[PDB]
């Protein structure tokens, strides 16, 4: 089970 | 005008670095909703105003069975609030983490609903840009609800392009890791990764170092378990084609390429959109305040409270517009 990913911008 | 004390605040469902999401009861109706509460200060500091405004504006007009519906969008002096339908089934991330892998049939069911939603968005010239397991959720019946429209772009038709370096590292299409602009095919790559995870039980590419990870996305061949079906392999190979022009769904017909692919041979796409298909897993929620399909990490946490400062595309209500 992978760790929680986090979205990002520029 | 709608305000904060129009709702009861029950449990933390998810937390972010911008804010938090909470299970709420609408006082005036007794009905249950999810509320995403962002802090204006953090948004303004990160120069992410256009994106947050986009998220509301896109939600204000979209209507589709597999997209989360927005009830209210309002703001206070220092907070932005989205009030949307509570997906009782929780995140697909929670389920895949617990079960490790889904069968090809189950993955086919979820993929068909994601494709249906992506067709719809792309037909409206909207590119979603953040397809991932955390942003795919299940409602009480077990149908897909795409959530989080914070990185959407509008006005993107045919071969229109975009310049913002955004998304989620592990899901970034290889062309987004290059200079200059990219097209709407990035969504189909996104699908590819989630399809890959659902059937192969891991990301196709992974490293905690992003430099290493971005090299993998651009350079590395995807591997398949031996037992995977040829059309499963074919679909993943097609969706995860590094070249967007050769990628499945990357042509002018958009979703039609993916829909006609042999992996979905046994799928009637009108049955999909009409919800005629039977979910393979049905959330066993015993009440409206049941949060079993959310992580204890969040639900165990108690709920504390940490001039024209106005955002000009909010203050929406589903009953009014
Ligand atoms: C807690 C799970 N969750 C739910 C939800 N769970 O049950 N019913 C639901 N609607 N909705 C979520 C939304 C959304 C949305 C709209 C407004 C529809 O675009 N965004 C999420 O995360 C965004 C971001 N990736 C990290 C984050 C998290 C928190 C603050 C700021 C940022 C999580 C969501």
């Amino acid at each position: 089970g992978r760790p929680r990913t986090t979205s990002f911008a520029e | 005008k709608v305000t904060m004390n129009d709702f009861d605040y029950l449990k933390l469902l998810g937390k972010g670095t911008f804010g938090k999401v909470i299970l709420v009861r609408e006082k005036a109706t007794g009905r249950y909703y999810a509320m995403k509460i962002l802090r204006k200060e953090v948004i303004i500091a990160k120069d992410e105003v256009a994106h947050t405004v986009t998220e509301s504006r896109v939600l204000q007009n979209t209507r589709h069975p597999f997209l989360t519906a927005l009830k209210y969008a309002f703001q206070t002096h220092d907070r932005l609030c989205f009030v949307m339908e509570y997906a009782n089934g929780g995140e697909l991330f929670f389920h895949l983490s617990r079960e490790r892998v889904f069968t090809e049939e189950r993955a086919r069911f979820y993929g068909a609903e994601i494709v249906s939603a992506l067709e719809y968005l792309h037909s409206r010239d909207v590119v979603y840009r953040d397809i991932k397991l955390e942003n795919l959720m299940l409602d009480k019946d077990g149908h897909i609800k795409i959530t989080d429209f914070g990185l959407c772009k509008e006005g993107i038709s045919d071969g229109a392009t975009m310049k913002t370096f955004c998304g989620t590292p592990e899901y970034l299409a290889p062309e987004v890791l290059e200079d200059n602009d990219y097209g709407r095919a990035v969504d189909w790559w996104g699908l590819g990764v989630v399809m890959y995870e659902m059937m192969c039980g891991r990301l196709p590419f992974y490293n905690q170092d992003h430099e290493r990870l971005f090299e993998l996305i651009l350079m590395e061949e995807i591997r398949f378990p031996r037992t995977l079906s040829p059309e499963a392999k074919s679909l993943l190979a097609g969706l995860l084609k590094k070249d967007p022009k050769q990628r499945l769904g990357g042509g002018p017909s958009d979703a039609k390429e993916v829909m006609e692919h042999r992996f979905f041979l046994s799928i009637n796409w009108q049955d999909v959109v009409q919800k005629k298909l039977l979910p393979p897993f049905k959330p066993q929620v015993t009440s409206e305040v049941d949060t079993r399909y959310f992580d204890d990490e969040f639900t165990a946490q108690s709920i504390t409270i940490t001039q024209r400062t106005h955002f000009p595309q909010f203050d929406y209500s589903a009953s009014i517009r």
Side-chain angles (χ1 to χ4, degrees), chain B residues 14 16 19-21 34 38 55 82 84-85 87 137 147-149 294:
Chain B
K20 52 191 174 182
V21 178
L38 314 180
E55 181 174 4
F82 300 91
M84 353 92 202
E85 64 196 18
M137 296 197 71
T147 199
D148 183 13
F149 298 80
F294 292 85

Side-chain angles (χ1 to χ4, degrees), chain B residues 168-236:
Chain B
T168 292
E170 294 84 358
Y171 290 80
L172 297 185
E175 70 270 24
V176 180
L177 298 167
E178 290 164 342
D179 289 338
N180 210 331
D181 58 351
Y182 58 91
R184 68 180 176 178
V186 305
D187 277 347
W188 297 120
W189 172 275
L191 180 60
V193 180
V194 288
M195 292 300 303
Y196 189 94
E197 288 174 296
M198 285 187 297
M199 292 188 284
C200 311
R202 64 169 180 91
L203 283 169
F205 313 98
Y206 180 71
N207 189 298
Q208 69 162 321
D209 193 351
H210 284 163
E211 287 178 12
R212 299 263 51 83
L213 171 54
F214 295 155
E215 173 159 304
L216 286 173
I217 290 169
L218 283 158
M219 312 302 169
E220 195 59 81
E221 281 195 312
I222 68 182
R223 297 176 66 74
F224 310 106
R226 292 176 184 273
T227 52
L228 217 69
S229 75
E231 42 265 313
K233 291 176 180 168
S234 183
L235 184 70
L236 297 175

Side-chain angles (χ1 to χ4, degrees), chain A residues 2 4-5 7-10, chain B residues 130 132 134 165 167 171 197:
Chain A
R2 61 169 180 79
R4 300 194 76 87
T5 65
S7 305
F8 79 101
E10 196 66 14
Chain B
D130 200 18
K132 54 176 178 173
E134 292 96 335
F165 187 55
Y171 290 80
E197 288 174 296

